Symmetry: D2
Subunit: 344 residues, 4 copies
């Protein structure tokens, strides 16, 4: 038996976390109750005024986000903005499993955080991405976990095998398109429906995006050199989706490179490689926790190309955090998680 609380339940990542558990088999056989659901947002209303899609829970009242609410729970999910969490991972019993979907415990260079986040470094928890090397083992039995930002999870997955095996250079460009949910739920003008419907704008360009030193950081653990990410984000008229287009100059032939992804990805059940001459779509991974990956080489520019489509809310946020919870409790890693999406 394991009791769970979701901090930030009021919104997209949190409510999509509940959604996953309602269909988990632990919940379906008493091994996991759903306890406290919290938010600074409208606390006293019903969860269902926020997520009409989760009706088995529609009757809950949201309590305040407080230590009092969150204690008494073998697992709490934090789904916040940067800054709320570090305060709270101390006011809670360390004997508990903490999962941060926020960034507070994501990076391992303190200077790199201050610069891109304008606050003080709170520490670094294991990365909630098991398909990376080493990340899988440091997760088994862990009781604290940082969940990668959606775009990083996309980038890293397209690019680590080729960097790891020494088949590209570390001067990578990654331009990935996204749905307006992984923008969060804070109602601002720029995220209305009339504004996003029928438009495509990039934002936070030129390496000024907080996920940039993160696609960086991850990339450097698979090689000796430094790295530089030209990282550009594009917000597009969908609710969910992350199609990641990554290039980097290489002088290797494509045959060698198919080997690498086949080699890094033949026992990963969430990662599926396109048969040659196919490509991922973001619509084939919606709902699911699966990343669809393909790779190619442009030779009249000596550039290598990888592509990765995931759900910015499953394998980019809530699925990563649930998958790392399965490793955290040693439960079967692929419980609560399909590979099949809700297309079209």
């Amino acid at each position: 038996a394991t009791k769970v609380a979701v901090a930030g339940a009021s919104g997209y990542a949190g409510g999509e976390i509940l959604r996953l558990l309602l269909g988990h088999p632990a919940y379906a056989d008493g091994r996991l109750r759903i306890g406290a659901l919290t938010a600074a947002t409208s606390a006293g209303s019903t969860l269902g005024e926020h997520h009409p899609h989760l009706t088995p829970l529609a009757h809950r009242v949201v309590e305040p986000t407080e230590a009092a609410v969150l204690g008494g729970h073998d697992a709490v999910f934090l789904a916040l903005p940067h800054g709320h969490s570090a305060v709270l991972a101390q006011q809670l019993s360390p004997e508990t499993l903490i999962i941060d979907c926020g960034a507070d415990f994501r990076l391992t260079d303190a200077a790199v955080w201050e610069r891109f986040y304008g606050s003080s470094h709170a520490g670094s928890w294991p990365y909630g991405l098991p398909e990376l090397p080493g990340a899988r083992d440091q997760l088994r039995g862990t009781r604290r976990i940082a969940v990668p930002g959606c775009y990083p999870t996309a980038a890293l997955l397209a690019l680590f095998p080729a960097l790891a095996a020494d088949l590209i250079e570390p001067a990578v460009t990654v331009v990935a398109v996204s749905g307006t949910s992984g923008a969060g739920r804070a109602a601002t003008t720029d995220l209305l429906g009339a504004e996003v419907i029928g438009s495509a704008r990039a934002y936070n360009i030129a390496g000024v995006h907080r996920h940039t030193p993160e696609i960086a950081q991850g990339l450097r653990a698979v090689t000796d050199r430094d790295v530089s990410v030209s990282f550009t984000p594009v917000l597009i008229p969908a609710s969910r989706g992350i199609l990641a287009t990554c290039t980097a100059r290489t002088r290797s032939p494509l045959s060698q490179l198919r080997a690498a992804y086949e080699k890094a990805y033949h026992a990963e059940p969430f990662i599926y490689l396109m048969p040659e001459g196919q490509l991922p779509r973001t619509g084939a991974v919606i709902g699911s926790n699966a990343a669809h990956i393909a790779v190619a080489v442009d030779e009249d520019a000596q550039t290598f190309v990888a592509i990765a489509a995931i759900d910015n809310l499953v394998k980019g946020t809530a699925g990563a955090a649930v998958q790392s919870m399965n490793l955290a409790l040693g439960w079967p890693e692929t419980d609560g998680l399909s590979v099949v999406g809700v297309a079209p």
Copy 2:
């Protein structure tokens, strides 16, 4: 007395041209009339059966596309941005101006047309980009025009003023999102509604896209160094639009990049550099001939990042054609083309 005719007038292009001409003050004041409206298939039908917005010519029939029908016009549009137009051009009086929104005559190097298409090169007509240097003058009069591809249109606006003054490496990455409409009314199944709704995907990647070299040809015009294009198109749940993100290695101050740009397009009435800290959205250009543009520098990555929004249907195909024809007859090159986008 100038009387005009469009071929392939059932497709997305010929319609958008027709919609523009209707708005020409030359159709208003009478210096211009909409003559024959031809098409491959559907010949023998009401144009309204295809373009319910063009209701002031919804009654006009459609003929098939033949030597005789297109003869008898002071100037003829050849809207088949995929259909091939090198025969039909070679059947009309050479004093009668021809404008081919297809790709047959854009190309000036000949190893490459067949390299990416596999047929028999025709020639180079003047290149319908009255913003690229030394192109307004090869257009001011002509009786033969080659209309560019939706993507080249936007990379070259984003990259030339800085590959000209050699402030950037002449090796370039380009990822550009576009709506469905650039893919023609050619009714295929992977271009259906539920398919493109809520999903984005790559295609003709690794420089295998027929517009890839066309960008190279564009930019050799402004540099003598070795050019190399890394180009990736992305399709998104929209109708119109292209946002283009273009990235190369740089060593120049943003200062020095930013003011080559303003010197390039201060007096070009159609191009619009974004104010400091405003970024281009595609929905701000839809329905108009605008090209909003922004540029920044990625310092750690020593990468120059350049974005351009265009309406893939106006200044992509049609809007170009009417801008060129305007200068090919010697009228105000703004005449009838707007730089106010239909938003939201």
Copy 3:
């Protein structure tokens, strides 16, 4: 030479009044003069941060909405947050041409206003729907204009002919779809991108939504039978527009309804009847002052269906305010507005 002012300039109405004003032939020759742009709580901002599509104007600085700013002009436009405009309409000087896109002045009977809006009624300016019989003659030369609401603009264009002839019974049932821009730019949470993308929902159902008397009032305006109305709106994922399905019990045959509509809207440039076996689509009218309309007949249930596509923001909001502006300054009716909508 006449000088125009926009209150609510940063709105969506405000942002379309101004786009229409910019393509005005009287604006190009200078007869009409664009002046003060104001916003409720948005002083000092440049227009271009709110409206990147109004480039020519974007350098302009938004001013407060006090009578001090709104003096001197010859026409004042009020697209300000619905209720509490009649306060400032009386703050300006009477001989000025006032055009309220708000509803403070559309309703005749003070009985209905208090029951649906909750305020000391204000009065009734000329209702601004030139198509509506009798209306046009009142709009000629007048210095006050009430702009119809969106849904009612389409419901009366759909219904009042077959009620003019009294060929239908006066209990009309109306279900309209519409795009988000109609909900205005008050950033709320169910207008967010991710909410409205890929979802549909009716709201304010069962006769409460305020636009319901506006149909009834305008419907009584051509018949002396008791007018009853089942109005239900549905929001959908599209930024612009309104497709309205209007049903009523019928005694007459199609040929007598048909022939009775073709007789109303022949003299009407903006209204286009659909060719038999055609049905309007909102995408065919977007950004234009259209009204595509189609009458058919359900024999097995003794009901008449009339379908009308408008665009919520032109023909249902802005288009009207210019259309009547023409006829109220003595300018031509069709001046500044089009019927060529931007498609696809």
Copy 4:
């Protein structure tokens, strides 16, 4: 205990069954096996190319539609269109459980079918909308099941618990909006991406639609009088989803019409009655066999209002089909089918 086949797997309905089975608890525990996946045209190709969202089966082979392919099975999911079902229905061992996502075996009156569907009348297996009066009993052990349509399922689910208690008059107006996947996968030029995005169109209006009599029947099968379906469907920019908007006159009290619903539906674990205040939205049921329902009374119009949302591809298709297959093979109705939606 049983192994199944699917005919038409290359369409959306066939697609959506294969998703729902992979998710079905008897597929985990071996009692369920996925046999043959049949389809015309693209026979002898990999189902992954058709449905890149169904990766556990990506490798399977499309076999042509033949009685020796589907022979040797306990079930056959027959996701083919209208008229296909009938001729292929009489080629299987009558001992086999036959599930038909088509029109052939739906309607129990022969005169109408002829007039509406032009071909022979073939008969009538039980309707697979189990929630209806006495319809669950008609499938508890059957071997022949006819899947109800999208509009019918939602229309019937909104209107029946009010007609069956003589609380509405049998004259019903039923406007419904639908995602374009509700017209299968016939690539034609009006269902294309650039066409559906931005536009809403009504189609097959005024009783022409083949689902009018379908509504009418199951609706006629709960009341004394005879009923009239004014039915109107409206394509909207989405892939999945149906928001039906059912009206009908009453003189009843609201609290009476509600308790009529609370009692029909509190049983049913697939019909979600909305809390006071809330209304159905399609987004909340996507990917889930639940139908959200809310009803009100327009006391002024004396008009009843029933609103239901569903997932066309699920409650209106594969999930109903699977819910019935569940009930055919004597399993829980609720296996492999979820009531939680995928938002947003």
